[PDB]
Design a protein around this ligand. Structure first.
Ligand code: SF4
Ligand code: SF4
Ligand code: FES
Ligand SMILES: [Zn+2]
Lengths: 39, 177, 56, 90, 687, 92, 86, 198
């Protein structure tokens, strides 16, 4: 074996995975931002 | 891919070196304080970051004897979705991040009224799958960046039954006139 | 007047992929690397058998 | 009539008109407007007319169909490829 | 939460979803023509038909709810056959108009046919022909292309609030549109074009000029109204070609007003392209930058401090105002107004003093809205549409001031200021109406605050809010809102400039692009005027020196929304001719005047801004404030005497409210076509 | 007390920048929340600008004639020391 | 000295492989220069001064006299960054 | 399919420390096999290929590189699985591919190498295959690839007295300089270019 094998295996493992996209993601309307008041 | 390294996500603080920035040291400190520490695709507050012309900007090929204007520019990083004219394009948009450079000179040469660019750079846009990729490219090539984050349409409840609703009892009196 | 089959239904776009483990990798290395065993429980029959059944 | 008046604009697809039609040899670099204005209106018996701009397919423009049953009887209509104008006969 | 199957892959959705919603969320694209994400569900077209097992007939994805355990096969041959049949029927009567159709290159019919249709036709008969209608100078009609998708009817009814569109007739001969010859006059009218998938309705100013593939797009924000509408600018070379809306869901939703969409063509004419100087007889001569800056520097060095004044324009950005404020402070000047009347009587001490504390979305959160001298139909049409949507969901609207033809129902409490005095002093039923409301909301137009008793009106409003419960810590609610009319005023307030500090007699006036509310009596006859500007409609006629500047689309600047949101306006094209940036001009002048400013680029200027106010460095964001009750506390012994004068609005002509819109051709056409028809002295009692 | 009754003819503006919730800006926040109207009533025309940001450091910026500014760091300063800092700032 | 200024402008490099690549390119360009492969008016771009006129011709000091004590920003403001006819 | 095919599996039999990832596609010829190879074994693998029986009768057909830093699927984004070779084009700075033909086995072999270092360094094989000299020179000058242990590193197709990598995605097709004749010098010079745009 050679010193650089581990990095090659890691980059092999990273490449194949599920790839979702930012769009097609559900975003709901946020609730009303209640106002805070100092004393 | 759109949704997926710490150093790329880290935003360095500004160090004042120019006399003008030494005068406005309080403002530099305040900007360092208020700006986000790290940048991720889940952020909501956009921000502008200056170019980092340190040893990290050594990988640019755009510093030539005839060109001293490309390095140090500030790009814009944002997602450009399909416009409001059509819903189902054959090539869809919004699946990638766009890095864009503002125009530097545009005119019309008079012999035939022909459109001319005074800057051959910034003619086309650059496309990346992830925001981290665009920021890493900017850090490699000595570019600043204006990062803005996408806005998406909310989810809503849809049904055909909503078209046919009972108006209610005829005795419902509206006291609000 | 027949238009339903103007476009091809079957096309030559098939792709086939093969993935193999390293040839020189032993059984114990494969069991350890795949998260079915740890380096401490090596050289123990019960651990090896449990890892083999879990892998299978 | 003033070409910038409300009526003139309304009856000209909200464009500033040119009765002389001689502005187009400079703005559009040709005298095609005059030549097409020299062609009179064609009166058709039916309610719909088909224009192809020629005697045969591929010699002219794609087949288009123009309605002659208008809200105001006998209002001429213009082909959008060729400038020919048609109206229902009486 | 139920499990369904889409092309064999299991997925989890909610039981309230439609098949189309589940497919889209799971990344599956279904063709459609009539479904829209904001309108009601219609099922007239059938392009979204999909195939489901144990269901013999194809099911419309958009108009059908999901069933637990069902399987949707969008890649089967049956779905392909369904889509091909529907596309064939859709294209049977479509005209051969793509070369002359403005929808070419972005038509959903074209793309859907190319991707999902059979690809060839067999219909060999006469198609139907439809005569075109006239809707006005903004919308062009080619009704042979309509597919009867009802999108325009649903948009007009449910979004615009107007009831002029419909479907008359039966069968194949039915027609979409108005029955009689009537224009489609309304704000947000052009939006209907974006809704129509075919070239049936097109942008009339944007007629035949461009094609989709030869345009470059930029994202920016609008300044024509104090709502910072998110917009997309499409250009070809050095010419800006069109403006489209974007998606924000906190501003303008999906829609823009007609002024935002079309008044951009006022940047192509009446432009100031070089520095100029005016002689005594009134002759204007083009000069160099050096000569103009040297003349103004000599004037600055010779003029006493108490004789120097400024006017802040409508389109003034944060950087420009920061530069001018720093320079005049260096010159020992603290007055930024010379106009006698029309000044806003609001203190810039706190951000909650002059802002929309409930944000744009607050109209959805409140149950009682009270407008005071506000006309949302003209000042913020998209906010008006939002309020209409909320009133369809139990929102009550009351109005003090001029009665307006809002497309919903509002109760007229009165016309003059005596109603406000009655409410503040009690013994008025609206006080109890506010008290019983869960989240009362008051929106005072900025215009009513330039009255000579604007401070008294402000104090009365604060008293009303504190007494009724518009501001309350128990509900964590701040319902006090101000709807501004100028972006420059908002930016000046954010930086901290007092609008009531007026120089009574100024001998040297810097007019930073102000043309509205400018009269010859405001400026002394023996003064020296330097006007910074892009257009030559007003102000440029008062000026001894004219310095050409950059428009909002010609510079990288920061704009504050009327609700407090900080936004980036981005450079789209450089300013024409010899124009320069505002802050660059002011910095050059400061250097030539012996008091240079400590910044040479935009970064250092933003460092100075961060010294002034850090929150202006957070973009697309609103900084919360915790001083609402302190700022809006009803102080003791403050004057609350109101003149017995009716409260009015400030807009007469919607299409022309500033220099850029006044220098527009399509705005003039819209005025000519719509002002006589839209003018009425009586309320439309139908709505 | 007499220092706040009249603002000196050299002072032109008192700007306060701090944080909404950080413990660093606790003293300045409370001081502004208690003594703003006391200063505003005695000087109805003098500007008193208050701006806050999420992580801003507490500053009391005093502006004088001819654009001279003097910014003082006011972190971890209680009521008395904030009082003294402002008094010294309005004294020069 | 001019080529040393070039190298000094390339001082911030810290990747040895990139530096080896640059050294290869430098040797190649030097060999091209010494064998008449390149043109003198083309290869002089690496030997030209950065802020000094060339010695074979006269120079203009007009912008030095007019913009004497003015900063760089003012000099770049008086001289535009785009044509003014359009 | 309808022909005799066998994988080149002996290559990974001899090199026991390497993972094996191979593809066959109907978009290629029926005798074309694509494999993924790590960068730190490329020289040894080529040494084995050049001399081993049933591989020795081989020739190098093509060499080039792919700039995958800007690779994005434009259509059918939901039709990608973990076995697609294009799945290895993401997050990877550079890709290099070599194509050989074997006469004994009558086969096409493509080898892919992922370069993830910023300096883009990889060993050269022009000392094994005489083809690789000009091919690797052109690839190095076009894409900025740093080849180590190369016979000749000089530029092949680019102009004199210029340093640039025009085939990177960041590069605009019009370049940064233009060539003009200069009357004041009686010879050709290079200047910053202003170009027409359609
Ligand atoms: S609406 Fe226009 S571009 Fe679209 S298919 Fe129909 S005619 Fe062609
Ligand atoms: S004119 Fe267009 S948008 Fe309107 S219903 Fe017809 S096809 Fe739909
Ligand atoms: S999109 Fe579903 S029926 Fe029209
Ligand atoms: Zn015709």
């Amino acid at each position: 074996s050679r010193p650089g094998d581990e990095e090659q295996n890691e980059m092999i493992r990273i490449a194949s995975q599920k790839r979702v996209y930012l769009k097609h993601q559900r975003v709901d309307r946020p609730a009303r931002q209640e106002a805070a008041f100092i004393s | 891919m759109l949704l997926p390294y710490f150093e790329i996500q880290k935003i360095p603080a500004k160090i004042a070196k120019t006399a003008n920035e030494k005068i406005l040291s309080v403002g530099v400190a305040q900007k360092n304080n208020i700006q986000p520490k790290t940048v991720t695709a889940q952020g909501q507050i956009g921000f502008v970051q200056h170019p980092q012309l340190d040893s990290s900007c050594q990988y640019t090929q755009f510093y030539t004897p005839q060109r001293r204007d490309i390095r140090g520019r500030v790009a814009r990083i944002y997602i450009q979705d399909t416009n409001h004219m059509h819903d189902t394009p054959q090539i869809p948009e919004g699946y990638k991040w766009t890095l864009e450079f503002e125009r530097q000179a545009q005119y019309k040469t008079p012999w035939m009224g022909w459109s001319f660019n005074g800057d051959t750079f910034s003619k086309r846009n650059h496309y990346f799958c992830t925001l981290e990729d665009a920021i890493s490219y900017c850090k490699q090539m000595g570019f600043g960046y204006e990062v803005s984050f996408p806005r998406s349409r909310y989810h809503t409840r849809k049904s055909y039954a909503d078209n046919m609703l009972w108006p209610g009892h005829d005795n419902a009196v509206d006291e609000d006139c | 007047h027949n238009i339903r089959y103007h476009h091809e239904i079957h096309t030559s776009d098939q792709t086939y992929h093969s993935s193999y483990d390293p040839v020189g990798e032993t059984t114990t290395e494969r069991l350890v690397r795949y998260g079915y065993l740890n380096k401490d429980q090596v050289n123990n029959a019960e651990a090896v058998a449990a890892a083999a059944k879990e892998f299978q | 009539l003033n070409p910038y008046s409300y009526e003139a604009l309304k009856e000209n697809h909200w464009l500033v008109s040119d009765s002389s039609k001689k502005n187009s040899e400079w703005t559009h670099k040709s005298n095609a407007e005059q030549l097409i204005a020299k062609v009179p209106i064609i009166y058709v018996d039916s309610n719909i007319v088909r224009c192809i701009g020629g005697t045969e397919i591929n010699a002219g423009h794609p087949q288009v169909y123009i309605q002659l049953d208008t809200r105001k009887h006998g209002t001429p209509q213009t082909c959008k490829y060729c400038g020919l104008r048609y109206a229902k006969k009486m | 939460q139920i499990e369904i199957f889409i092309d064999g892959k299991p997925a989890k959705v909610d039981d309230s979803y439609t098949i189309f919603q589940a497919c889209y969320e799971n990344g599956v694209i279904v063709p459609r023509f009539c479904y829209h994400e904001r309108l009601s569900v219609a099922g007239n077209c059938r392009m979204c038909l999909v195939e489901v097992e144990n269901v013999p007939k194809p099911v419309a994805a958009c108009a059908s709810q999901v069933v637990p355990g069902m399987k949707i096969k969008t890649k089967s041959e049956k779905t392909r056959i369904h889509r091909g049949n529907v596309m064939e029927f859709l294209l049977a009567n479509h005209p051969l108009d793509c070369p002359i159709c403005d929808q070419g290159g972005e038509c959903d019919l074209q793309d859907i046919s190319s991707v999902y249709g059979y690809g060839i036709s067999r219909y060999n008969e006469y198609k139907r022909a439809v005569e075109d209608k006239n809707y006005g100078p903004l919308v062009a009609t080619s009704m042979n292309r309509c597919i009867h998708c009802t999108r325009c009817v649903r948009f007009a009814t449910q979004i615009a609030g107007v009831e002029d569109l419909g479907k008359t007739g039966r069968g194949k001969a039915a027609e979409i549109g108005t029955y009689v010859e009537k224009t489609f006059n309304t704000e947000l009218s052009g939006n209907v074009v974006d809704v129509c998938p075919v070239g049936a309705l097109t942008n009339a100013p944007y007629a035949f000029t461009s094609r989709p593939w030869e345009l470059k797009s930029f994202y920016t924000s609008d300044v024509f109204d104090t709502l910072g509408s998110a917009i997309q600018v499409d250009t070809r070379g050095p010419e800006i070609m069109r403006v489209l809306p974007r998606i924000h869901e906190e501003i303008n939703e999906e829609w823009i007003s007609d002024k935002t969409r079309h008044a951009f063509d006022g940047l192509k004419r009446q432009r100031i392209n070089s520095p100029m100087k005016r002689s005594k007889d009134g002759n204007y001569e083009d000069i160099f930058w050096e000569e103009a800056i040297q003349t103004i520097s000599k004037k600055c060095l010779n003029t006493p401090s108490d004789q120097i004044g400024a006017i802040i324009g409508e389109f003034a950005d944060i950087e420009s105002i920061t530069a001018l404020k720093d320079f005049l402070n260096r010159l020992d000047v603290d007055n930024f107004e010379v106009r006698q009347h029309g000044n806003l009587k609001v203190s810039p001490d706190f951000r909650a003093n002059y802002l929309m504390n409930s944000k744009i979305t607050g109209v959805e959160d409140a149950d009682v809205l009270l407008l005071v001298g506000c006309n949302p139909r003209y000042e913020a049409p998209v906010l008006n549409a939002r309020i209409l949507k909320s009133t369809r969901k139990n929102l009550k609207v009351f109005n003090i001031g001029t009665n307006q033809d809002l497309n919903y129902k509002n109760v007229h409490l009165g016309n003059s200021t005596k109603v406000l005095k009655e409410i503040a002093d009690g013994t008025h039923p609206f006080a109890e109406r506010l008290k019983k409301a869960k989240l009362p909301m008051i929106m005072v137009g900025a215009s009513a605050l330039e009255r000579e008793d604007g401070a008294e009106l402000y104090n009365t409003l604060k008293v009303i809010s504190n007494k009724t419960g518009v501001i309350s810590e128990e509900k964590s609610w701040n319902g006090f809102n101000i709807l501004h009319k100028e972006m420059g005023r908002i930016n000046a307030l954010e930086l901290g400039i007092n609008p009531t500090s007026v120089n009574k007699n100024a001998k040297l006036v810097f007019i930073l692009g102000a043309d509205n509310n400018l009269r010859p009596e405001d400026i002394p006859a023996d003064a020296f005027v330097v006007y910074f500007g892009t257009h030559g409609d007003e102000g440029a006629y008062y000026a001894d020196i004219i310095l050409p500047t950059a428009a909002y689309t010609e510079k990288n600047a920061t704009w504050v929304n009327t609700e407090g949101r900080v936004q980036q306006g981005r450079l789209v094209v450089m300013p024409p001719g010899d124009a320069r940036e505002d802050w660059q001009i002011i910095r050059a002048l400061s250097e030539e005047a012996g008091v240079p400013l400590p910044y040479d680029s935009l970064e250092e200027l933003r460092y100075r801004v961060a010294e002034l106010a850090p929150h202006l460095l957070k973009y697309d964001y609103i900084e919360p404030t915790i001083f609402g009750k302190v700022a809006l506390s009803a102080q003791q012994g403050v004057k609350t005497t109101l003149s017995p004068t009716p409260i009015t609005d400030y807009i007469d002509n919607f299409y022309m409210t500033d220099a850029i819109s006044r220098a527009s051709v399509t705005m003039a056409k819209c005025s000519t076509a719509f002002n006589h028809e839209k003018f009425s002295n009586f309320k439309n009692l139908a709505k | 007390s007499s220092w706040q009754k009249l603002i000196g003819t050299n002072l032109r503006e008192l700007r306060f920048v701090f944080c909404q919730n950080s413990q660093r800006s606790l003293g300045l926040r409370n001081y502004i929340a208690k003594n703003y109207w006391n200063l505003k009533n005695q000087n109805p025309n003098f500007p008193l600008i208050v701006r806050e940001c999420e992580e801003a450091d507490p500053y009391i910026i005093a502006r004088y004639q001819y654009g001279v500014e003097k910014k003082a760091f006011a972190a971890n300063n209680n009521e008395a020391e904030i009082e003294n800092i402002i008094k010294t700032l309005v004294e020069q | 000295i001019n080529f040393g200024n070039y190298i000094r402008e390339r001082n911030h490099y810290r990747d040895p492989g990139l530096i080896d690549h640059r050294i290869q390119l430098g040797y190649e360009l030097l060999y091209e220069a010494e064998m008449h492969f390149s043109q003198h008016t083309i290869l002089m771009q690496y030997l030209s001064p950065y802020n000094t006129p060339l010695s074979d011709r006269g120079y203009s000091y007009l912008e030095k006299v007019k913009y004497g004590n003015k900063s760089k920003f003012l000099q770049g403001f008086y001289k535009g960054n785009k044509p003014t006819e359009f | 399919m309808q022909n005799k095919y066998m994988q080149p599996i002996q290559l990974f039999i001899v090199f026991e420390k390497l993972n094996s990832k191979m593809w066959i596609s109907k978009k290629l010829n029926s005798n074309h096999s694509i494999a993924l190879i790590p960068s730190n074994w490329f020289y040894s693998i080529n040494l084995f290929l050049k001399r081993e029986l049933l591989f020795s009768n081989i020739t190098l057909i093509e060499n080039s590189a792919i700039d995958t830093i800007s690779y994005n699927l434009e259509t059918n984004q939901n039709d990608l699985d973990k076995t697609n070779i294009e799945n290895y084009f993401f997050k990877n700075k550079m890709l290099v591919f070599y194509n050989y033909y074997n006469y004994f086995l009558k086969s096409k072999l493509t080898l892919f190498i992922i370069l993830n270092n910023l300096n883009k360094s990889i060993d050269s094989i022009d000392r094994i295959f005489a083809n690789a000299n000009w091919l690797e020179r052109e690839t190095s000058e076009m894409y900025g690839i740093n080849y180590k242990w190369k016979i000749d590193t000089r530029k092949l197709l680019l102009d004199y007295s210029k340093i640039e990598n025009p085939m990177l995605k960041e590069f605009q097709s019009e370049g940064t300089q233009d060539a003009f004749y200069n009357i004041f010098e009686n010879q050709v010079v290079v200047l910053k270019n202003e170009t027409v745009e359609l």
